[PDB]
Design a protein around this ligand. Structure first.
Ligand SMILES: *[C@@H]1O[C@H](CO)[C@@H](O[C@@H]2O[C@H](CO)[C@@H](O)[C@H](O)[C@H]2NC(C)=O)[C@H](O)[C@H]1NC(C)=O
Ligand SMILES: *[C@@H]1O[C@H](CO)[C@@H](O[C@@H]2O[C@H](CO)[C@@H](O)[C@H](O)[C@H]2NC(C)=O)[C@H](O)[C@H]1NC(C)=O
Ligand SMILES: *[C@@H]1O[C@H](CO)[C@@H](O[C@@H]2O[C@H](CO)[C@@H](O)[C@H](O)[C@H]2NC(C)=O)[C@H](O)[C@H]1NC(C)=O
Ligand SMILES: *[C@@H]1O[C@H](CO)[C@@H](O[C@@H]2O[C@H](CO)[C@@H](O)[C@H](O)[C@H]2NC(C)=O)[C@H](O)[C@H]1NC(C)=O
Ligand SMILES: *[C@@H]1O[C@H](CO)[C@@H](O)[C@H](O)[C@H]1NC(C)=O
Ligand SMILES: *[C@@H]1O[C@H](CO)[C@@H](O)[C@H](O)[C@H]1NC(C)=O
Ligand SMILES: *[C@@H]1O[C@H](CO)[C@@H](O)[C@H](O)[C@H]1NC(C)=O
Ligand SMILES: *[C@@H]1O[C@H](CO)[C@@H](O)[C@H](O)[C@H]1NC(C)=O
Ligand SMILES: *[C@@H]1O[C@H](CO)[C@@H](O)[C@H](O)[C@H]1NC(C)=O
Ligand SMILES: *[C@@H]1O[C@H](CO)[C@@H](O)[C@H](O)[C@H]1NC(C)=O
Ligand SMILES: *[C@@H]1O[C@H](CO)[C@@H](O)[C@H](O)[C@H]1NC(C)=O
Ligand SMILES: *[C@@H]1O[C@H](CO)[C@@H](O)[C@H](O)[C@H]1NC(C)=O
Ligand SMILES: [Zn+2]
Ligand SMILES: [Zn+2]
Lengths: 650, 650
């Protein structure tokens, strides 16, 4: 009538090969002595031998304050009614902190089945000598979809923040790495892991910044859970029998992970970064002040477009950043988690200080255009013959545009670097096209006075490039057919604009111009970055940096000669452009289909432990732009007495 | 030595009052006969009497294919280390479909504790005669945070979609209502419920549209889970002892819910809606064709701004809609779920057809301005004296702006109505300010020819209103201090613009103008809607609809007389404005802090079972705008012979 019930004492680190049926329940009693200042983990492992799909085993682990249960072989789900079946299951047991200095704690394991056949299982309860993580010591382990793991880290003395870096040398088991507090239970299942805490799907890398003020116990759990399907990490899926009713044996895929918890930049990294920024971008101001005191003693549309954008920029990103602030789902903003230093609510504060160069060099330029205009008007009371003939008609209206577009760049990008994304991308790099545009009009608008009608001619072209990026944005991972057709339609524009400016060197002019477009084509074809609007920016400068040379070479072959004061700004502008494009090309693939794949491109800080490569791009770009404004400005200053060459140049 | 183990037969619908200690385990054996075409639910209920916090009961329900376990009193968590403790727990048992026509199925209940004191519990397994929901029949039930519930709905014959409407006559227990398939297990816990399926947090209402193609079993589970804290529904929290270590007794709060699953519009509602739209908006075209054949026989900035917006509009919302498409978290887009008819990937397709009036009446207007220009130029070959003196200088350049801004409105709003939101709001209503702006310039630019300098004067003002909405957007739930200070700064603008146009009626002019601003102030102060940019739109038309009257009243007191052809468009424009503002004011509070609160304002469809109030607003607004363009156009057609009154009017 009544079932057998076998109660038997058991021991740690000793494997039991028993069996149960529908008329048999096995109960094992384990005990262990726990101590306050040395915590251990108890990991139960079950494994059924050559089991038929009739009816599973039912395993219950009973502790003083918790009941855990599962059924073996454990069945997990897929997307489209796909079941995966695991013969072997494991769990680390959650247990609350011990109230005494040391106490004996019992727990029980209960094995029962409702199938009428002898089912042979294999049980083993082991003690983990590696449960407590250490600061600065790599630790490696294994996990599968039926064997989730978790470890404990407790903060050292006086360390107020850490970063947990987890790495894997192989791509496709997926994973979720959650960071939870040390209160039982622990949510280490495919459906519990995203309930609370802050987490990150990985493929090869994950990195999470943790601070004490979120964990009043001064400790937390790092939880690793492997997933049954790799779609969330950019992987494909097969199904030969998978969609059928029966489950699919999937116990053959493991993930081998390494975890390292290391201290973060304490506080003086922030001071060093701020002092570096201020020093380098005020050296320019001091240099200009001394330069002036030496040498002297020897419109609304651009702002409104940004204003009618910045508020949508401010509102969109803030409404989008707050999710990770409250949800902990860190697969939403595409930071560089290995170099991302929080301040207040900002996650990557260093990716915002970097945009101080645009602000403070777009403001130093406006203080040059203003000083040139004022000085020129202070000359107009003396009435020298150089009104507009002995020199060139001064049109600062589009200088002010250049000096104020550089300012808005240090706000469109500083606000974009709050949660970089795909929907969020167009704010920063697309507005550098404007500066690229204005740097082209000047050299045209210098040899052609009545170009105010042509000023609006280029305004139409700028939206097309934004539309072209938008057209590329419509399919961010578009096929080659999009890429090559855009590549070939690029090829037409090579000779198309070359004809506008066109005599031996003009036939030589076609040599370097067409090559670069052809050169830049292949590096696009072979790579095809997910980021396209950033790609075309490179074509922007490369043609722009070429077109300076053309204006010089034609000027090189006249009686007009280049003075050093507007020449020393040509070599240094090109040197900084060379460096700036090096760090620009470092991060160009570091944005891909999914955050898991976009995260295996992260890399540590470089400068003062604070700034990465993309911060060094915000630095050199704002100096190259400013270094190019003074080229357009000073270049033709030797023509302060000539009225024939300047007038009949074009 | 070994524990007692009591195995005892049990019965449904009969309560057991037993006790266990650390040396006693109780096991109850239940059985029940299940049948294929009649499914029942088995609900286990446990309740501990006057239990001390020493060590809980541990309850295990063991079935053939599933093990369920919990611990009583059950502890749930809060946000800031807050624990809530429930003495009574209940679960409905998941069970896979029976393979035979009828079979006997056993399950077991296992009660055990590790505390050394007699703990007295109360167990009851009951059978539910109300597990299978029916189509079109309200069903009411109770639930708490420790007693989650779920019911089964199986599709009737030939019904391809249903809507599940759940309602509660009281606000603050929160809830999550998930819709899952009928494969075990069921995720009805505070941490499982959001794993899969599509769900909705409610406060008083929820409504979810379900389609067979997602559920190949032709059935699903409606799962209701009550939450321990009401922050996600806009509620506050107390904590007198709550933040302390001990848990808080919280078994005193219930939620009483009603569930109704009703069939959705089959297919001809879509046909009726499309036919209605086409008929009403082509009656205008046919009417104009007959009107012309009767009577005759008797620039880039506006598009570029939208183009540099529409692509960000298209990209942002599409990148934002796809989340609910793949996540099922329907607390992301602020639809009207009671009237939201899907088509393809679009969730609310009727909120897009409604924007056909802007497209097809912004296009019919451009075919009037074009015909007036062509006819006028076909007259300029005859050279009548009415070039610009006997009439008024024709400036269609800003007519084209009006006729093309109405077109872009039917795309900015049609794209906004793909996931209405807070970040997403500015796209639709802010661009109706432009049409409101251009409707003001015409009457000004008719009495003042050289107003091209004043054309850009108002362009600055438009961004300020957008900035004012943005300033209001920065704190969407801002305090009164924002609201009243903006209200009083409004009061200055009352007399400020009144002075611009200013004689007895001009002193009367101050009567109605200031009152409306004062009138519109209180209805803002008393209500203070979360939607502010939509509020100021009302102030937009109200002043705009007033300023038409002023131009008439001054015209009413001259020798100039109003012909009926430009008068019959004045009464009908005002009638449609009156109706349009009625349906506009229906949905004005239907957007609040949280989607749960924003959803208790939903209301059923009105017209042809397809269009709600806000669709009737897209309909009447596009006819009122068009009805106002023909006022600005035809009004002063009687001045086709006068050159004194027109010239010296202003
Ligand atoms: C707690 O468990 C330990 C096992 O880890 C028990 O110690 C064993 O007791 C059995 C009883 O005969 C024998 O195998 C040995 O005496 C012990 N083996 C080892 C490896 O220590 C211990 O008795 C248990 N304590 C209680 C109170 O049950
Ligand atoms: C994690 O799993 C890997 C894969 O099984 C283990 O590496 C293997 O260990 C066995 C034991 O001798 C051998 O087959 C080889 O040494 C390893 N095979 C390889 C690397 O292909 C590894 O030992 C497991 N444990 C850890 C901590 O990594
Ligand atoms: C299945 O459970 C039912 C109870 O629902 C059992 O029927 C009862 O059996 C006990 C045994 O003495 C008595 O209370 C009555 O004979 C029955 N009561 C009722 C209300 O039916 C039944 O015996 C069980 N079947 C098996 C095979 O165990
Ligand atoms: C749901 O819970 C409510 C609240 O307890 C129940 O309504 C009460 O029922 C008891 C039973 O007689 C009485 O106190 C009153 O009839 C009700 N009190 C009220 C309405 O304040 C209700 O019966 C429960 N069940 C359902 C299906 O609603
Ligand atoms: C288990 O039950 C069987 C009855 O089938 C009987 O051998 C005895 O009661 C139990 N066995 C032992 C070893 O106690
Ligand atoms: C800390 O643990 C060690 C382990 O040997 C032992 O001295 C004792 O259990 C604890 N002592 C203190 C001072 O915490
Ligand atoms: C150790 O735990 C026991 C529980 O039985 C209890 O007496 C107390 O918490 C601790 N012992 C002492 C002497 O404090
Ligand atoms: C295995 O089955 C045999 C009979 O087939 C019987 O001895 C018992 O059910 C099982 N043996 C065990 C549990 O040792
Ligand atoms: C329960 O165990 C006790 C020993 O404390 C003893 O009465 C007997 O073995 C069991 N009771 C019954 C009624 O079988
Ligand atoms: C359906 O259920 C009824 C219940 O009385 C019974 O006729 C039988 O179990 C089933 N019959 C068919 C035809 O499915
Ligand atoms: C009913 O279930 C039993 C399980 O014991 C099995 O014989 C079969 O699935 C069904 N019976 C028949 C006669 O088909
Ligand atoms: C209640 O406790 C008494 C002794 O305090 C003992 O009879 C047994 O543990 C409990 N009584 C039951 C289970 O009937
Ligand atoms: Zn950047
Ligand atoms: Zn609308």
């Amino acid at each position: 009538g009544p079932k057998n019930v076998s109660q038997k004492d058991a021991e740690f680190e000793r494997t039991y090969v028993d069996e149960v049926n529908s008329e048999l329940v096995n109960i094992y009693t384990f005990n262990h002595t726990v101590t306050r200042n040395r915590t251990e983990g108890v990991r139960v492992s079950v494994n059924v031998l050559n089991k038929q799909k009739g009816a599973p085993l039912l395993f219950v682990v009973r502790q003083k304050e918790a009941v855990v249960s599962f059924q073996v072989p454990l069945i997990l789900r897929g997307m489209f009614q796909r079941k995966y079946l695991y013969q072997k299951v494991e769990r680390t047991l959650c247990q609350p902190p011990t109230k005494n200095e040391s106490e004996i704690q019992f727990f029980y394991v209960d094995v029962s089945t409702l199938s009428p056949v002898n089912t042979t299982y294999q049980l083993r309860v082991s003690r983990m000598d590696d449960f407590v993580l250490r600061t600065g010591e790599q630790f490696s382990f294994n996990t599968t979809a039926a064997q989730p793991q978790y470890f404990k880290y407790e903060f050292p003395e006086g360390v107020d923040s850490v970063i947990v870096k987890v790495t894997s040398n192989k791509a496709f088991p997926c994973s979720v790495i959650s960071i939870q507090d040390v209160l039982c239970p622990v949510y280490d299942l495919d459906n519990n892991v995203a309930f609370i805490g802050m987490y990150q799907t990985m493929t090869k890398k994950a990195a999470i910044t943790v601070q004490r003020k979120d964990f009043p116990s001064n400790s937390f759990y790092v939880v690793v859970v492997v997933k049954t399907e790799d779609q969330a990490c950019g992987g494909s899926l097969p199904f030969y029998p998978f969609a059928e009713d029966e489950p699919v044996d999937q116990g053959h895929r493991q993930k081998t992970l390494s975890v390292l918890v290391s201290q973060a930049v304490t506080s003086e990294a922030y001071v060093s970064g701020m002092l570096f920024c201020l020093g380098i971008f005020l050296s320019f101001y001091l240099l200009t002040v001394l330069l002036a005191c030496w040498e002297n003693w020897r419109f609304w549309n651009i702002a409104t477009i940004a204003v009618f954008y910045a508020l949508p920029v401010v509102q969109l990103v803030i409404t989008y950043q707050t999710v990770v602030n409250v949800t902990g789902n860190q697969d939403i903003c595409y930071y560089n988690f290995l170099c991302a230093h929080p301040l207040g609510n900002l996650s990557a504060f260093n990716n915002i200080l970097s945009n101080l160069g645009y602000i403070l060099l777009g403001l130093l330029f406006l203080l040059i255009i203003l000083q040139r205009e004022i000085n020129h008007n202070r000359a107009l009371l003396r009435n020298d013959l150089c009104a507009l003939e002995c020199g060139i008609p001064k049109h600062f209206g589009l200088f002010y545009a250049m000096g104020t577009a550089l300012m808005m760049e240090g706000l469109l990008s500083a606000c974009y670097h709050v949660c970089p994304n795909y929907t969020n991308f167009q704010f920063d790099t697309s507005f550098m096209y404007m500066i690229a545009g204005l740097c082209m009009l000047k050299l045209y608008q210098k040899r052609h006075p009545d170009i105010n009608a042509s000023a609006y001619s280029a305004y139409a072209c700028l939206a097309i490039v934004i539309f072209f990026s938008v057209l590329g944005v419509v399919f961010g991972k578009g096929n080659t057919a999009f890429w090559i057709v855009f590549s070939i339609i690029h090829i037409i524009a090579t000779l198309l604009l070359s004809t506008q400016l066109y005599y031996v060197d003009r036939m030589v002019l076609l040599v370097m111009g067409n090559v670069i477009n052809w050169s830049l084509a292949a590096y696009g074809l072979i790579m095809r970055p997910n980021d396209f609007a950033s790609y075309l920016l490179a074509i922007g400068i490369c043609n722009l940096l070429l077109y300076f040379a053309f204006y010089i070479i034609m000027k090189l072959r006249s009686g007009e000669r280049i003075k050093l004061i507007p020449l020393l700004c040509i070599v240094c502008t090109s040197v900084v452009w060379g460096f700036a494009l090096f760090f620009f090309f470092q991060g160009l693939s570091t944005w891909q289909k999914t955050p898991a794949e976009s995260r295996e491109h992260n890399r540590d800080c470089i400068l003062l432990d604070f700034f990465d490569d993309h911060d060094i791009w915000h630095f050199l770009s704002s100096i190259a732009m400013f270094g190019s404004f003074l080229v357009l400005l000073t270049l033709d200053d030797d023509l302060d007495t000539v009225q024939r060459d300047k007038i009949y140049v074009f």
